[PDB]
Design a protein around this ligand. Sequence first.
Ligand code: HEM
Length: 78
Amino acid sequence: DGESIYINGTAPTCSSCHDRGVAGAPELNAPEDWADRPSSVDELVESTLAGKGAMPAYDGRADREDLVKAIEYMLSTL
Ligand code: HEM
């Protein structure tokens, strides 16, 4: 599911950064970190595909669908 994707079914693995908050990556169950961001999954996924700050571009490494499933999973902890 989205959890599987987020934890291990991603390359690079989202967990590795977001679990700890590497380079200030918006963490899980941390609504404040997301409040300011365009929380809309459909927007967040673009940021994810393109890359943001330390986050590399995902375009090709993870499909929008994969990403979406991971992102909604991330957001569901907030
Ligand atoms: C794994 C595929 C993965 C997902 C999914 C993911 C999502 C994600 C979102 C939705 C954001 C916010 C986008 C926005 O602000 O519009 C976000 C932000 C950051 N991430 Fe991420 N992220 C995934 C993976 C990784 C990896 C592997 C790293 C560490 C190199 C990482 C880091 C960050 C950082 C830093 C940001 C934003 C920093 C900023 O400038 O605000 N993410 N991620």
